[PDB]
Write a protein that binds this ligand. Structure first.
Ligand SMILES: CCCCCCCCCCCCCCCCCC(=O)OC[C@H](COP(=O)(O)OC[C@H](N)C(=O)O)OC(=O)CCCCCCCCCCCCCCCCC
Ligand SMILES: CC(C)CCC[C@@H](C)[C@H]1CC[C@H]2[C@@H]3CC=C4C[C@@H](OC(=O)CCC(=O)O)CC[C@]4(C)[C@H]3CC[C@]12C
Ligand SMILES: CC(C)CCC[C@@H](C)[C@H]1CC[C@H]2[C@@H]3CC=C4C[C@@H](OC(=O)CCC(=O)O)CC[C@]4(C)[C@H]3CC[C@]12C
Ligand SMILES: CC(C)CCC[C@@H](C)[C@H]1CC[C@H]2[C@@H]3CC=C4C[C@@H](OC(=O)CCC(=O)O)CC[C@]4(C)[C@H]3CC[C@]12C
Ligand SMILES: *[C@@H]1O[C@H](CO)[C@@H](O[C@@H]2O[C@H](CO)[C@@H](O)[C@H](O)[C@H]2NC(C)=O)[C@H](O)[C@H]1NC(C)=O
Ligand SMILES: *[C@@H]1O[C@H](CO)[C@@H](O[C@@H]2O[C@H](CO)[C@@H](O)[C@H](O)[C@H]2NC(C)=O)[C@H](O)[C@H]1NC(C)=O
Ligand SMILES: NC1=N[C@H](O)[C@H]2[C@H]3O[C@]4(O)O[C@@H]([C@@H](O)[C@@]2(N1)[C@@H]4O)[C@]3(O)CO
Ligand SMILES: *[C@@H]1O[C@H](CO)[C@@H](O)[C@H](O)[C@H]1NC(C)=O
Ligand SMILES: *[C@@H]1O[C@H](CO)[C@@H](O)[C@H](O)[C@H]1NC(C)=O
Ligand SMILES: *[C@@H]1O[C@H](CO)[C@@H](O)[C@H](O)[C@H]1NC(C)=O
Ligand SMILES: *[C@@H]1O[C@H](CO)[C@@H](O)[C@H](O)[C@H]1NC(C)=O
Ligand SMILES: *[C@@H]1O[C@H](CO)[C@@H](O)[C@H](O)[C@H]1NC(C)=O
Ligand SMILES: *[C@@H]1O[C@H](CO)[C@@H](O)[C@H](O)[C@H]1NC(C)=O
Lengths: 119, 173, 1418
C-alpha cells in the first residue's frame, strides 16, 4: 500500500504541526472495517506508544506525554489519515507512524515521519 | 400464470356450483403463506356471517345449516401458497342467494421483512330455476345468422344483375 | 542502357558537382520504376560481379543532376543514398562508410533483425519474467542500437535528403532507442515497460509488403470521414432524445415501506454501503448484483407488496448504465449501435419506464444501428473496390508495358516386378477407383458420427470394427498406387500426400494401446470430398476462399494477427496487476473472473472476444479495476481499429472471390470429371438395363354454364370483391390477437370471436367456390397462392366439421387447431410489396440450399470433433439452492454426488441441457457458438472438463478455448462470408434479368422512386430579385451574405452545446439559466425567420429548407408556450418531457450546411420504399410467430429470458420478445426454458389458476424448430436484404456527378460534307477522310494528325475504298458523347430513319473496316 508522508517534518516550537498522511488504496473506505493506528517512538529501536486509533470511530488515547494537544485532522473516506499536534513542544521530537488497513485490501500501509522541533 | 377471473352470478337450482375467487400475487417468484375466510349473508338480510375457513391444508366449516355439507374446497392443493380460493357447492338450494365475501390474508416473505397483506373479493349470487342463456350468446348467434343471410343475398343479387347484363352482351355479338 | 553501370568515383562525384553547379548558375519527375526499394528492370540484364554491392553512380536522370549515388544488392534491389558527407565526416568512399553500405544491404542483416524482433516479441509475453531475462533485454537493446547505427553510418542523420530521419518509419525505432537508454538511468513503472512494445511494430518495416498494406488501410480510413461525422451526429441526436425521455429513470428501486426506529429514506441512504446492507431495504432478485427496477406507470415492472417504487441510489452495472448525463447517454447509444448486449439495456429501460417506449428502441435499432453499420460497410467496400480496381489496372497495364519493352528489346536486337507394377496400374481408373474410395470414406464418416455419449458396449465395439475395416481398405488402396507411381510420381499431387498422412495416422493409432487426440485427424479424413472436382461448385468456392485468405490476402491476415498480438500484450502490461490486486471489486470471492488480463493468454482471449462483437462487459470490469479513462481509451481503440481491419479482410475476400468469378474465363477441368464420366457410364448402364428388361418382359409375355362461368369470372376480379376480401382477411387475422391467457376474463369477446370464426370460414369457403367456378381446376391448382389458400381453408373446414360433429378434443385435432396461426398468410397474395419480396426470396432458395449444404459438411467435422472431446463431460454436482458447482475437493466423481444426494437434499447431478452428447446437440451448440449468443456458458463448461463421470475442475483444460477459437475463425467467419456472398451475387442475377431494376419496388414505387431521384439535381434557379424598397434592400443584402449563414450555424451549434449540459438533479439556478438561454435562442432564430420574411417576400416558400425552418420556428414557439402552460395549469411529468422533445427541431437544421451528410441522408430517403416493403414482410412473419408462441409457450416455466414481463403470454409481450430476437440477441435465453421436459426440471401437472391447461413444460422439438427457423428467417431477410438494398441505393446516390448535355450542331457537319461531296452521294474516299475531319469545327474537330485517331474508330467501308456519311457521323458523335446507353438507342433510330428513306440496300454492304484495312497494309 502506497502511503505518502514527509520523511522529515520540521516545525517551530509552539506552532501547530500537521502530520500529513494519505494512502492510495483503490478499495472504498468502509468505516466498519477500516483500521488506523498512529504510534510514536523516540528512536528506531525504541518503544512505540499508540496515541490515536480508528476502530469504528476516532479513539484518542490521550497519552500523558501529549496532554490534549493531539487531534485527528484527516478524512478516511478521502484517503487522508493526517493528525494535528497543537502547540508543539520540544519533547514532541521523535518518530510518528501511520499504520493503515483497508479491508479487503490485503496489504497494510505504514508511513513514518521524523518530527524535528526548531527553536 | 395466475389470471384473476371472476365468478358467475347465476346458479341452477338443485345442481352443483363452483364459486370463483382468484387472487394473484404481484410478483410470482415471491414466497407466501395464504389463508382465507369466506362470509355470506342470505339475500334479504344485512349481516356477513362466516361460513368457512381454509387453513394449512384443512378446510374448517362453520355450522350454518345452509352449508352443512354441500360444500367442498376446490381451490389449490397442498401448496400453502394458495393463490386460488374457489369453493364448490353441491346440491344448490334456494337459500344460497345473497352476497359472498372472500377475504384473503397473505403473509409475504422477504430477506429481512414480512408483510402481511389483505384483499377482499365480493360476489353476488342469485339462484334461479332454469339456466338462462346469456344475452350475449343469443345476440351473437342471431347476428351471425343475419350476416350470413345478408351476404348470401347480396351475392345472389349481384350475380343476377351481372348475369342478365352478360347474357345481353352475349346476344349482342 | 543495359550496360550503364559505373562505380561511384571521386572524379565522377566532382563531375556531378560541377554539372549541377553550372546548370543552376545558368538557371521533371523521377522514373518511378527506378525508385529505391523496387527491383531492377531486367532490361539492364545481369549486374557485373564487380559492381554489385558497391557505391554506383545514379541511374535515374532526374537524380543524375542531384548529388546522390545508388547501391544494388544481389537481389536487384535499388538503394538510393546521399553522397554528401554523412555528418560532414565520411565520404562515399570512406572505408567505414563503404563497409557500412556493404552490410546494410546484405541478406543476412535483414533476416537477423526479423528473428530478433520475433524472439523479443516472444519474451514480451511473460507477466513476471525471471531475473536473468534482464541480460537478454540488454542484448535486444544492444542489437537495436547496433542496427540503427549502421544505418546512420550509411545514410547520415539529417545532413541530407536521403537520410535516416527522412523516412518516418525510422522515427519509431529512433524513439525506441531513446527510451532504451532513458529508462535505465533516469526513473509509474508499469507505464514505461509498455512503450517497448513498438519493437513489435518494427516488424511492419521489415517484412516485405506490410508498409503497402498499412498504407492501403490509411487510405481506406481517410474516406470514412463523413460517415464518422454522420455517426457522431445521429448518436448525439438520439442521445439527446434519450436524455430527454429517460433521464434518471434507471435509478428506480423498490424500497420497503415499513421502516423501524422512525427512519426516513434520507436517514438511511447515507448510512449503509454494502451489498448485504442494500439487500435489507431494497429488493434484489436472487443472485443479482443490482436492485430490481420498477416504475410508476401501469405497463412498467411491478414491486411486490410492501415495496414502493422510488428514485434513489446508483445506476445498475456499477453505475455505467444510465441516461443521466450526456456522456453516459452517448456511451449507451454507441452500445446500442453495435448491438452489444443491447437486449439487457432494452429490458432495463422497458421495465423502468414502461412497455410503450418500445417504439424508441425500435427506431434506434432500425434507423440507427442497421443503417449506419450498413453505411460503413458500403463505404469501406466502395473504397476497397476502387483502390483494387486501380491496382489490378496498374498490374495489367504494367504487364502490357513489360510486353512492350520486351518487344522493344526484340526490335532493337533485330523384371516380374516391373510387369507386375504395370499389371496393377491398370486399375487406376479415375471414373471407377476414385469414385469407390470416395464412397467408402463418406460411409466411414457417417459411421463415426453415430458416436454418442451413453453407449452400450456393443455399439462401441461395432464402431471399432468399422474403423478397422475402413483403415484396411484405405491402406490397401494406398500401397497399390504407391507402387504404380513410385515416389517421384506419387508425391506430386496434394491428395496423395493427404491420403498418406491419413493412413499413417490411422495405423499409428491402430497399434497404440493408448488413446490420443488424433481422433481429430481421423475426423478430418472427410475433407477427401474436396477432391471431388469443380462439379460441386460451392465447395470449390469455399476452398478457394480459404486459399485467398492465406494466399493473395495473406498480408492482411498477418496484419490482423499482429494487431491482436500487440493489443494483447499492451493490455497485459497496463492492466494485469490491477486485476490481480483490486480483484475483490469485480468478484465476491477475491478470485480472478472468467475473463481478465492477468496473463497473456486470457488477455488475448479478451481481445478476440472484443473483435467478435462483445466489448461492454469486460470493459465494465476493467473500468472498475483500472481507471475509467484508460480503459475506455484502450477498448475504443481496439474496437474501432480491429473492426475496421476485420471489415477490410471480409470485404476483400468477398469482393475478390465473387467479382473474379464474374471476371474469370474457361476453366474446363483437365481430366473429364471422373464423376461425370462415371455418371454418363452409370446412366448409360441403367438405360441399357431398362431396355433389356423391357425386351425381356415383352419376350416373356348448355350455354347457361358458360354464362355462369363468365359472370363469376367478372365477379372475383371486380375491385369491390378484392377490397372486401382483404378487409375480411385483416379482421380474421386481428381476431387471433385476442386469444391469450386472459381471454377467460373477458367472456363476451370470447363468445363473439367464437361465433365470428364461423362467419369467416363461411365467407372464405364461398370465395374458394367462386374461384373454382371462375377459373376451373386446371387454372386453379397450378397456382401457388391458390394452393396455399386452399390448404388454409381446408384445415379451417376440418376443424369446423369435427367440432360441430362433436368429437372435438380428439387428440391431434387440438393440435391441428393451432394451425389457425397460418390464416395471416392469406395476405401475401394481396399486397404487391410482400409479393415481390417473397418472389425474390424464393428465387434465391436454390443457392441458399447449396451453400447451406456446404456449411453442413464443414460443420459436421467440428461437431464430430466436439463429440469426441466433450461427450458426456458436462455433468456437474451442483447445489440447487444457489446453483453452485460443488468445489470438487469433496465430490470428486459421480458416485460421490449420488452419495451426497442420499445424505443431503438439494444437490443434483445435472447436465448442461445443450452439450456435445451427440451430433444433434453438437449442431445446436455450434450454432450458439457461431452466433456468439449463448457461447459463454458452453465454453466454460468445456474448459472445466475432466473426464466422463468426474467432477469438473476450474480450468482443468484451459486450452479447449483454442478449439472454440478455431471453430469461430472458420465456421463463423468464412462461412458467413460465403453465405453473404452468394446471396448478393444471386440478388444481382435477379436484378439483371429484369433489366437492372430494383427488385424490391412495385410499379407505383418505381415511379415515385424516379421522381424522387430527380430531386438530387443541380438546376440553378434565379436568385430572388433585390427589392427596390431600400428599407428592405439593406435587410436583403444582409440576410443573403454567407457570413449570415455561418453565424446562424454557429448559433445552432451553441444551442446544441447548451442542450448537452443538462444532467440529473442539476440545480434550480442552473435550470433557470438554461431556460432563459433557450428563450434567447428562440428569439434569435425567430428573428432570422422574420428578416428572411421581409426580404424574400414570397420567395421564402420556394425552398424546402426554408419551409423546414419556418416549421421548426413554429414548433419551437408552440412547444415553449404549451410547456409553460402545462407547468402552470397542470402536472404531468411524462407528458412534459414528451412535449419538451419538440425543441430538438432546432438542432436538425445542422444538416443544411454539411454538403456531405445530405448525400447520405438522401440515400436513406431513396431507399425508404424498399425498406418499407421488407418491413411489411417482416412484420407479417413476426405476427405469425407471435400467434404460435402464444399458442404454444404461453405456460412455460420462468427460468431466464422468460420473466414477468417479456413472456409469451399476451400479444404485446410476444411481439416484444420477437422484436428482440429479430437481431438474434439473447435467443438462447428464450430457448433455454423450453428445452426442459422432465421432472425435476418442470412439472407436467401444474395447475394454473384460472385456466384448464395443465403443466409447464414445453416441447423441445417444437421450440428448437421455432427458434432456429425464426433466427434463420430473420438473418435471411433483415440482414441480407436490408444490406443489399442499401448497398445499391448508396452507390446510386454517390453518383451525383451525372448529366451529360450537348446540342444538335450536326448542320455544321453537313455544311462541310457538301464541299467534299458535291454530288450528294453520301460517300467519300478514305484519303479525303484525313482532311474532312480537319475541316470540321469543334467539338467534332480532329486536328492534325487526324490519321492516328481516325483508324482507331474502325469505320465500315463499302466497295471502292469509300465510307458512308452516317458511319462517320456516328463515329464522331460517339467520340464526344462516349459509350452511353442512348448512343445505341439513337443509332437504332438513325439507321432505321435512313432505311425508311433509302430502300437501296445493295449499295451499303461493308467489305472492310479502317482498323482491319491498316492491318492488311502492314
Ligand atoms: O383459361 C381460359 C378459361 C378461363 O375461363 P373463362 O372465363 O371462360 O375465360 C376467360 C376469358 N375472359 C374468356 O371469356 O374466355 O379456362 C378454360 O377454358 C380451360 C378449361 C379448364 C378445364 C377445367 C374445367 C373445370 C370447370 C370448373 C369446375 C367446376 C367446379 C364446380 C364447383 C363445385 C360445386 C359447386
Ligand atoms: C497502428 C495500429 C495498427 C496499431 C495501434 C496500436 C496502439 C493502439 C497500441 C500500441 C502501443 C499502445 C500504447 C502504449 C502506451 C500507452 C501509454 C499509456 O499511458 C501510460 O502508460 C501513462 C503512464 C503514467 O502516466 O505513469 C496509455 C496506453 C497507451 C497509449 C497504449 C495505447 C494502445 C497503443 C497505442
Ligand atoms: C376429387 C375432387 C373433389 C377434387 C379433385 C382435385 C384435382 C382435380 C386437383 C388436385 C390435384 C391437382 C393436380 C396436381 C398435379 C397435377 C400434375 C400436373 O402435371 C405436371 O405437373 C407435370 C410436371 C412435369 O411434367 O414436369 C397437371 C395438373 C395436375 C394433374 C393437377 C390437376 C388438378 C388436380 C388433380
Ligand atoms: C395436404 C398435405 C398433407 C400435402 C400437401 C402437398 C402440397 C403442398 C404439394 C403437393 C402438390 C404440390 C404442388 C404441385 C404443383 C404446383 C404448381 C407450381 O406452379 C407451376 O408449376 C407453374 C407452371 C407454369 O406456370 O408454367 C407451384 C408448386 C405447386 C403449387 C406445388 C406446391 C406443393 C404441392 C401443393
Ligand atoms: C394477517 O392478517 C390476518 C387478518 O387480519 C391476521 O389474523 C388475525 O389474527 C389476530 C391475532 O393476531 C386475531 O385477533 C384476528 O381475529 C385475526 N383476524 C382474522 C379475521 O383472521 C393474521 O394473524 C395476520 N398474519 C400474520 C402472520 O400476522
Ligand atoms: C446449499 O446452499 C445453502 C445456502 O448457501 C447451504 O445452506 C447454508 O449452510 C451453511 C452451513 O454449511 C449455513 O451456515 C448457512 O446458514 C446455510 N444457508 C442457508 C441459506 O441455508 C446448504 O448447506 C448447501 N447445501 C449443501 C449440501 O452444502
Ligand atoms: N453480448 C452478449 N449477448 C448474449 O445475448 C448474452 C447472453 O448470452 C451470453 O452467452 O451470456 C450472457 C451475456 O454475457 C451474453 N452477452 C453472452 O452471449 C447472456 O445474457 C445469457 O447467456
Ligand atoms: C372439486 O370438487 C369436486 C367435488 O368433489 C370434484 O369432483 C372436482 O374434481 C374438484 N375439482 C378440482 C378442480 O379440484
Ligand atoms: C338435492 O337434495 C335434495 C334433498 O335431499 C334431493 O331431494 C335432490 O334429489 C338432490 N338433488 C341432487 C341432484 O342431488
Ligand atoms: C332455508 O332457509 C330458511 C330460512 O331462511 C329455513 O327456514 C329453511 O329450513 C331452509 N331450508 C333448508 C332446506 O335448509
Ligand atoms: C422515534 O419516535 C418517537 C415518537 O414516539 C420520538 O419520541 C423519538 O425521538 C424518535 N426517535 C428518533 C431517533 O428520532
Ligand atoms: C470416487 O472417489 C472415491 C474417493 O473416496 C474413490 O474411492 C472412488 O473409487 C472414486 N470412483 C471411481 C469410479 O473411481
Ligand atoms: C441412501 O442411498 C442408497 C442408494 O444409493 C439407499 O440404498 C439407502 O437406503 C439410502 N439411505 C438413506 C439414508 O436414505
Amino acid at each position: 500500500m502506497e502511503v505518502t508522508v514527509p520523511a522529515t517534518l520540521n516545525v517551530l516550537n509552539g506552532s501547530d504541526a500537521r502530520l500529513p498522511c494519505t494512502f492510495n488504496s483503490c478499495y472504498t473506505v468502509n468505516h466498519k472495517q477500516f483500521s488506523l493506528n498512529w504510534t510514536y517512538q523516540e528512536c528506531n529501536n525504541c518503544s512505540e506508544e499508540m496515541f490515536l486509533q480508528f476502530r469504528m470511530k476516532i479513539i484518542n488515547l490521550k497519552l500523558e506525554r501529549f496532554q490534549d494537544r493531539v487531534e485527528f485532522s484527516g478524512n478516511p473516506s478521502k484517503y487522508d489519515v493526517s493528525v494535528m499536534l497543537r502547540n508543539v513542544q520540544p519533547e514532541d521530537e521523535g518518530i510518528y507512524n501511520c499504520y493503515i488497513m483497508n479491508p479487503p485490501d490485503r496489504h497494510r500501509g505504514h508511513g513514518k515521519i521524523h518530527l524535528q522541533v526548531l527553536m | 400464470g395466475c389470471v384473476e377471473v371472476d365468478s358467475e352470478t347465476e346458479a341452477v337450482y338443485g345442481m352443483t356450483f363452483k364459486i370463483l375467487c382468484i387472487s394473484c400475487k404481484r410478483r410470482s417468484e415471491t414466497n407466501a403463506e395464504t389463508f382465507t375466510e369466506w362470509t355470506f349473508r342470505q339475500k334479504g338480510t344485512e349481516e356477513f356471517v362466516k361460513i368457512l375457513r381454509y387453513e394449512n391444508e384443512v378446510l374448517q366449516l362453520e355450522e350454518d345449516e345452509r352449508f352443512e355439507g354441500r360444500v367442498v374446497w376446490n381451490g389449490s392443493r397442498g401448496t400453502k401458497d394458495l393463490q386460488d380460493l374457489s369453493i364448490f357447492i353441491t346440491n344448490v338450494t334456494y337459500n344460497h342467494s345473497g352476497d359472498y365475501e372472500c377475504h384473503v390474508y397473505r403473509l409475504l416473505f422477504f430477506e429481512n421483512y414480512e408483510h402481511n397483506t389483505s384483499v377482499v373479493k365480493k360476489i353476488h349470487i342469485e339462484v334461479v330455476d332454469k339456466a338462462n342463456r346469456d344475452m350475449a350468446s343469443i345476440v351473437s348467434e342471431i347476428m351471425m345468422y343475419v350476416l350470413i343471410v345478408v351476404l348470401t343475398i347480396w351475392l345472389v343479387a349481384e350475380m343476377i344483375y351481372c348475369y342478365k347484363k352478360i347474357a345481353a352482351a352475349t346476344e349482342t355479338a | 542502357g543495359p550496360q550503364s553501370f559505373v562505380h561511384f568515383t571521386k572524379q565522377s562525384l566532382a563531375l556531378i558537382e560541377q554539372r549541377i553547379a553550372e546548370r543552376k548558375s545558368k538557371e521533371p519527375k523521377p522514373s518511378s520504376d527506378l525508385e529505391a526499394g523496387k527491383q531492377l528492370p531486367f532490361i539492364y540484364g545481369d549486374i557485373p560481379p564487380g559492381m554489385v554491392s558497391e557505391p554506383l553512380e545514379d541511374l535515374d536522370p532526374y537524380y543524375a543532376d542531384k548529388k546522390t549515388f545508388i547501391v544494388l544488392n544481389k537481389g536487384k534491389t535499388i538503394f538510393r543514398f546521399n553522397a554528401t558527407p554523412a555528418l560532414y565526416m565520411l565520404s562515399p568512399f570512406s572505408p567505414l562508410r563503404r563497409i557500412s553500405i556493404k552490410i546494410l544491404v546484405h541478406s543476412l542483416f535483414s533476416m537477423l533483425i526479423m528473428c530478433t524482433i520475433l524472439t523479443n516479441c516472444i519474451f514480451m509475453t511473460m507477466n513476471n519474467p525471471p531475473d536473468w531475462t534482464k541480460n537478454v533485454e540488454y542484448t535486444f537493446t544492444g542489437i537495436y542500437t547496433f542496427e540503427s547505427l549502421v544505418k546512420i553510418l550509411a545514410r547520415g542523420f539529417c545532413v541530407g535528403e536521403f537520410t535516416f530521419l527522412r523516412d518516418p518509419w525510422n522515427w519509431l525505432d529512433f524513439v525506441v532507442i531513446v527510451f532504451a537508454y532513458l529508462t535505465e538511468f533516469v526513473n509509474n513503472v508499469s507505464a514505461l515497460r509498455t512503450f517497448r512494445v513498438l519493437r513489435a511494430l518494427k516488424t511492419i518495416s521489415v517484412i516485405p509488403g506490410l508498409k503497402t498494406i498499412v498504407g492501403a488501410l490509411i487510405q481506406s480510413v481517410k474516406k470514412l470521414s463523413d460517415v464518422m461525422i454522420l455517426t457522431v451526429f445521429c448518436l448525439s441526436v438520439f442521445a439527446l432524445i434519450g436524455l430527454q425521455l429517460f433521464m434518471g429513470n434507471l435509478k428506480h428501486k423498490c424500497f420497503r415501506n415499513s421502516l423501524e426506529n422512525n427512519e426516513t429514506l434520507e436517514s438511511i441512504m447515507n448510512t449503509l454501503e454494502s451489498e448485504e446492507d442494500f439487500r435489507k431495504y431494497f429488493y434484489y432478485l436472487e443472485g443479482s448484483k443490482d436492485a430490481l427496477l420498477c416504475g410508476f406507470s401501469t405497463d412498467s415492472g411491478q414491486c411486490p407488496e410492501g415495496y414502493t417504487c422510488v428514485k434513489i441510489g446508483r445506476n445498475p452495472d456499477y453505475g455505467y448504465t444510465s441516461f443521466d448525463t450526456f456522456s453516459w447517454a452517448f456511451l449507451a447509444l454507441f452500445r446500442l449501435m453495435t448491438q452489444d448486449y443491447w437486449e439487457n439495456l432494452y429490458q432495463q429501460t422497458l421495465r423502468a419506464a414502461g412497455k410503450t417506449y418500445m417504439i424508441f428502441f425500435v427506431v434506434v435499432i432500425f434507423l440507427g444501428s442497421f443503417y449506419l453499420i450498413n453505411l460503413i460497410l458500403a463505404v469501406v467496400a466502395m473504397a476497397y473496390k476502387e483502390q483494387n480496381q486501380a491496382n489490378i489496372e496498374e498490374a495489367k497495364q504494367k504487364e502490357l508495358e513489360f510486353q512492350q519493352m520486351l518487344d522493344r528489346l526484340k526490335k532493337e536486337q533485330e523384371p516380374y516386378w516391373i510387369k507386375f507394377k504395370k499389371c496393377i496400374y491398370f486399375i487406376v481408373m479415375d471414373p471407377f477407383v476414385d469414385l469407390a474410395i470416395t464412397i467408402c470414406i463418406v460411409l466411414n464418416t457417417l459411421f463415426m458420427a453415430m458416436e454418442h455419449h451413453p453407449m452400450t458396449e456393443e455399439f462401441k465395439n461395432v464402431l471399432a470394427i468399422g474403423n478397422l475395416v475402413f483403415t484396411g481398405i484405405f491402406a490397401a488402396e494406398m500401397v497399390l498406387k504407391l507402387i504404380a507411381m513410385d515416389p517421384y510420381e506419387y508425391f506430386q499431387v496434394g491428395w496423395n500426400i493427404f491420403d498418406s498422412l491419413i493412413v499413417t495416422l490411422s495405423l499409428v493409432e491402430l497399434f497404440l494401446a493408448d488413446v490420443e487426440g488424433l481422433s481429430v485427424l481421423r475426423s478430418f479424413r472427410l475433407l477427401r470430398v474436396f477432391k471431388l472436382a469443380k462439379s460441386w461448385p460451392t465447395l470449390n468456392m469455399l476452398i478457394k476462399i480459404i486459399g485467398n485468405s492465406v494466399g493473395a490476402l495473406g498480408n492482411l491476415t498477418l496484419v490482423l494477427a499482429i494487431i491482436v498480438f500487440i493489443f494483447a500484450v499492451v493490455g497485459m502490461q497496463l492492466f494485469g496487476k490491477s486485476y490481480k490486486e483490486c480483484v475483490c471489486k469485480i468478484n465476491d470471492d477475491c478470485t480472478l473472473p472468467r475473463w481478465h488480463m492477468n496473463d497473456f493468454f486470457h488477455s488475448f482471449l479478451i481481445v478476440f472476444r472484443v473483435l467478435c462483437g462483445e466489448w461492454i462487459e469486460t470493459m465494465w470490469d476493467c473500468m472498475e479495476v483500472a481507471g475509467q479513462a484508460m480503459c475506455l481509451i484502450v477498448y475504443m481503440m481496439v474496437m474501432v481499429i480491429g473492426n475496421l481491419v476485420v471489415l477490410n479482410l471480409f470485404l476483400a475476400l468477398l469482393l475478390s472471390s465473387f467479382s473474379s468469378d464474374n471476371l474469370t474465363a474457361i476453366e474446363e477441368d483437365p481430366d473429364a470429371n471422373n464423376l461425370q464420366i462415371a455418371v454418363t457410364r452409370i446412366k448409360k448402364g441403367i438405360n441399357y438395363v431398362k431396355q433389356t428388361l423391357r425386351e425381356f418382359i415383352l419376350k416373356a409375355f348448355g350455354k347457361i354454364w358458360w354464362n355462369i362461368r363468365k359472370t363469376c369470372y367478372k365477379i372475383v376480379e371486380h375491385s369491390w370483391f378484392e377490397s372486401f376480401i382483404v378487409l375480411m382477411i385483416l379482421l380474421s387475422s386481428g381476431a387471433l390477437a385476442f386469444e391469450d391467457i386472459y381471454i377467460e376474463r373477458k367472456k363476451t369477446i370470447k363468445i363473439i370471436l367464437e361465433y365470428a370464426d364461423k362467419i369467416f370460414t363461411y365467407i372464405f369457403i364461398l370465395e374458394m367456390l367462386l374461384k373454382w367456378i371462375a377459373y376451373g381446376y386446371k387454372t386453379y391448382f397450378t397456382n401457388a397462392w391458390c394452393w396455399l389458400d386452399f390448404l388454409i381453408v381446408d384445415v379451417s373446414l376440418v376443424t369446423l366439421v369435427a367440432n360441430t360433429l362433436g368429437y372435438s378434443d380428439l387428440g391431434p385435432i387440438k393440435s391441428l387447431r393451432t394451425l389457425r396461426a397460418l390464416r395471416p398468410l392469406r395476405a401475401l397474395s394481396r399486397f404487391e410489396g410482400m409479393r415481390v419480396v417473397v418472389n425474390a426470396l424464393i428465387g434465391a432458395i436454390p443457392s441458399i440450399m447449396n451453400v447451406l449444404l456446404v456449411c453442413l459438411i464443414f460443420w459436421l467435422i467440428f461437431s464430430i470433433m466436439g463429440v469426441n472431446l466433450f461427450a458426456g463431460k458436462f455433468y456437474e454436482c451442483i447445489n440447487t439452492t444457489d446453483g453452485s458447482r460443488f468445489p470438487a475437493s469433496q465430490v470428486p466423481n459421480r458416485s460421490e454426488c449420488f452419495a451426497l444426494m442420499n445424505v443431503s437434499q438439494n444437490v443434483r447431478w445435472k447436465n448442461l441441457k445443450v452439450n456435445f452428447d451427440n451430433v444433434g446437440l453438437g449442431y445446436l451448440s455450434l450454432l450458439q457458438v457461431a452466433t456468439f449468443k449463448g457461447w459463454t456458458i458452453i465454453m466454460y463448461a468445456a474448459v472445466d472438463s475432466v473426464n466422463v463421470d468426474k467432477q469438473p475442475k476450474y480450468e482443468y483444460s484451459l486450452y479447449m478455448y483454442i478449439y472454440f477459437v478455431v471453430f469461430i475463425i472458420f465456421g463463423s467467419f468464412f462461412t458467413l462470408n460465403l453465405f453473404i456472398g452468394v446471396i448478393i451475387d444471386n440478388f444481382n442475377q435477379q436484378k439483371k434479368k429484369l433489366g437492372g431494376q430494383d427488385i424490391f419496388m412495385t410499379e407505383e414505387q418505381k415511379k415515385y422512386y424516379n421522381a424522387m431521384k430527380k430531386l438530387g439535381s443541380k438546376k440553378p434557379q434565379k436568385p430572388i430579385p433585390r427589392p427596390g424598397n431600400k428599407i428592405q434592400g439593406c435587410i436583403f443584402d444582409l440576410v443573403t451574405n454567407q457570413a449570415f449563414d455561418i453565424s446562424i450555424m454557429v448559433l445552432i451549434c451553441l444551442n446544441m452545446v447548451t442542450m448537452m449540459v443538462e444532467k440529473e438533479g442539476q440545480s434550480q439556478h442552473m435550470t433557470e439559466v438554461l431556460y432563459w438561454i433557450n428563450v434567447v435562442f428562440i428569439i434569435l432564430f425567430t428573428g432570422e425567420c422574420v428578416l428572411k420574411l421581409i426580404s424574400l417576400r414570397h420567395y421564402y416558400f420556394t425552398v424546402g429548407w426554408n419551409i423546414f425552418d419556418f416549421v421548426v420556428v413554429i414548433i419551437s414557439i408552440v412547444g415553449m408556450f404549451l410547456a409553460d402552460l402545462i407547468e402552470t395549469y397542470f402536472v404531468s411529468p411524462t407528458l412534459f418531457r414528451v412535449i419538451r422533445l419538440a425543441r430538438i427541431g432546432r438542432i436538425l437544421r445542422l444538416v443544411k450546411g454539411a454538403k456531405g451528410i445530405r448525400t447520405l441522408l438522401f440515400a436513406l430517403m431513396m431507399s425508404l420504399p424498399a425498406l418499407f416493403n421488407i418491413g411489411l414482410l417482416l412484420f407479417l412473419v413476426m405476427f405469425i410467430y407471435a400467434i404460435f408462441g402464444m399458442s404454444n409457450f404461453a405456460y412455460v416455466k420462468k427460468e431466464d429470458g422468460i420473466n414477468d414481463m417479456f413472456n409469451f403470454e399476451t400479444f404485446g409481450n410476444s411481439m416484444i420478445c420477437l422484436f428482440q430476437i429479430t437481431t438474434s440477441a439473447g435467443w438462447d435465453g428464450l430457448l433455454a426454458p423450453i428445452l426442459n421436459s422432465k421432472p425435476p426440471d418442470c412439472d407436467p401437472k401444474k395447475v394454473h389458476p384460472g385456466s384448464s391447461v395443465e403443466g409447464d413444460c414445453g416441447n423441445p422439438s417444437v421450440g428448437i424448430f421455432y427458434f432456429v427457423s425464426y433466427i434463420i428467417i430473420s438473418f435471411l431477410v433483415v440482414v441480407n436484404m436490408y444490406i443489399a438494398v442499401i448497398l445499391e441505393n448508396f452507390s446510386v446516390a454517390t453518383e451525383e456527378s451525372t448529366e451529360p448535355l450537348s446540342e444538335d450542331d450536326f448542320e455544321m457537319f453537313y455544311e462541310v460534307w457538301e464541299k467534299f461531296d458535291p454530288d450528294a452521294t453520301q460517300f467519300i474516299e478514305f484519303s479525303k477522310l484525313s482532311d474532312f475531319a480537319a475541316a470540321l469545327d469543334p467539338p467534332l474537330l480532329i486536328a492534325k494528325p487526324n490519321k492516328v485517331q481516325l483508324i482507331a474508330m474502325d469505320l465500315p467501308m463499302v466497295s471502292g475504298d469509300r465510307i458512308h456519311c452516317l458511319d462517320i457521323l456516328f463515329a464522331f458523335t460517339k467520340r464526344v458523347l462516349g459509350e452511353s446507353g442512348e448512343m445505341d438507342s439513337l443509332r437504332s433510330q438513325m439507321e432505321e430513319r435512313f432505311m425508311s428513306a433509302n430502300p437501296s440496300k445493295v449499295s451499303y454492304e461493308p467489305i472492310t473496316t479502317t482498323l482491319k484495312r491498316k492491318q492488311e497494309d502492314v
